[PDB]
Design a binder for this molecule. Sequence first.
Ligand SMILES: Nc1ccccc1N1CCOCC1
Ligand SMILES: Nc1ccccc1N1CCOCC1
Length: 284
Amino acid sequence: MEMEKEFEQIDKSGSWAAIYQDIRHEASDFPSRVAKLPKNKNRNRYRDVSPFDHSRIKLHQEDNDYINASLIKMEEAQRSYILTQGPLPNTVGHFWEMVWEQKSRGVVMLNRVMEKGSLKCAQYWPQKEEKEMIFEDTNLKLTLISEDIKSYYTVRQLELENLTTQETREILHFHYTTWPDFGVPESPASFLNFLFKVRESGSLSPEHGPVVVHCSAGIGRSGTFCLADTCLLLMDKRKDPSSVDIKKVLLEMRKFRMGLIQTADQLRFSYLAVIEGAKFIMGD
Ligand SMILES: Nc1ccccc1N1CCOCC1
Ligand SMILES: Nc1ccccc1N1CCOCC1
């Protein structure tokens, strides 16, 4: 069923809450035993948001390999994403260890450091060129190279150095700065423009490790970003673009991380983004 007609049918019938609860009921339940070990309590921002054991990213260290992060591998679309929480004061070194070990080119941030008067993630990148950051626990150095501030997003060039080997890599930081404190954007136009800037950078391409994507918990806004990207790529690849079922793609992604798309409003917004993005890249 053409999702644009499915969309109008749900709107006219006001059944977004009912559709969303059906997804919640059908979603996968896999163990998260490593996340719940007592040694890992200060590595989790939220007690109810944990990576599954089967899809969790492992740090390359013998001490404690745990980070709150999941590999979402989309087989038909040929895209992979790492979805992670906003870094905590004691996990900023782990965060950049993961970027280095997974060979990521891009970090996508969908939150502000402060929202609703509370801290939603650590200040984990340098704000001035001449004041670099050293992460002594993981032996990394991070330098701000350049910053480009736009009305709806900021792009930063960062240099990450492995102090053990003196190898260096360019990381691109894509920061969507205008998601409102409550609810979802009225139009998906700025969010789609942002998704197209990340694509144009190479950060989502198979010559690199998976893109790292986060918000505060790494399931809601982060879920909307990967769901919209994957649905648009499938509409390009298939003979019948109308065969793409957004609810089925979301359930596939929920096999790899719990709770992706946190509200019926986020579900409606994901539908709007895919419908408007399809008719921009193409039409109909
Ligand atoms: N410790 C900390 C907590 C919250 C955010 C950033 C950091 N930085 C780590 C590396 O040295 C500069 C500060
Ligand atoms: N200059 C450099 C040398 C060797 C590896 C990577 C880089 N980067 C290029 C873009 O700015 C961030 C760092």
